[PDB]
């Protein structure tokens, strides 16, 4: 739910 993009 936060910016879980690597």
């Amino acid at each position: 739910a936060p910016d879980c993009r690597p």
């Epitope: 739910a1 936060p2 910016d3 879980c4 993009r5």
Partner: single-chain antibody, 225 residues
């Protein structure tokens, strides 16, 4: 990757100030950006986030600054901004732009001088080179789980921050293999398998709670001999 803040300085209580941060070395527009501030008394404190163009640039704010600060971004200039109105003494601190999975990258900070969930970490731990040491991070709400997206951030001498772990268990790029993050029991945990002298630092965890981050008070890790 560089993030580089500017705009800090002296402001009178009730006054306004705009901070800027320019990003390079990563695809800025693909990542959310945050402002986090560090004070003498209140420690590390998350201020604001701004999401992507596909999220209609949605913003969220700490309760302490809601209604006084506005975060924004210009993807065309790879920059994020913090407009701050009605400043108070409690707003004094060093302000950092930071982001990526979720706090891999930190700028150098810009100082602003004006004039409830608790995350708990060990105050201090002492180790020696080659030992295995585990730092922990507890939430006042219950268990830490993957939904808290635990991050671990290292502070080295004089306010230099680098993210080590995000999303509970994911080493940021270029982070040494001796660092790992996990959940242990009902807490987030940072393990250093074979501590090294240069690992002497303050380590902060941050946990996500739906729409905001809460940082722990930090653990001072001393590495003796």
């Amino acid at each position: 990757v560089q993030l580089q803040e500017s705009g800090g300085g002296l402001v009178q209580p009730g006054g306004s100030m705009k901070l800027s941060c320019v990003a390079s070395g990563f695809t800025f527009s693909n990542y959310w950006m945050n402002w986090v501030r560090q004070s003498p008394e209140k420690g590390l404190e998350w201020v604001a986030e701004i999401r992507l163009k596909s999220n209609n640039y949605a913003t969220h704010y700490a309760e302490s600054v809601k209604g006084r600060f506005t975060i924004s971004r210009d993807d065309s200039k790879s920059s994020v901004y913090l407009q701050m109105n009605n400043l108070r003494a409690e707003d004094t601190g060093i302000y950092y732009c930071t982001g990526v999975g979720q706090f891999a990258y930190w700028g150098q900070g810009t100082t602003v001088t004006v004039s409830d969930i608790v995350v708990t970490q060990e105050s201090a731990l002492t180790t020696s080179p080659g030992e295995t040491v585990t730092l922990t991070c507890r939430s006042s709400t219950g268990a830490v789980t993957t939904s808290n997206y635990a991050n671990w951030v290292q502070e080295k001498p004089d306010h230099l921050f680098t993210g080590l772990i995000g999303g509970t268990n994911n080493r940021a790029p270029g982070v040494p293999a001796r660092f790992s993050g996990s959940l242990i029991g009902d807490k987030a945990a940072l393990t250093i398998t074979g501590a090294q002298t240069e690992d002497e630092a303050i380590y902060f965890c941050a946990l996500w709670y739906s729409n905001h981050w809460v940082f722990g008070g930090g653990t001072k890790l001393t590495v003796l001999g």
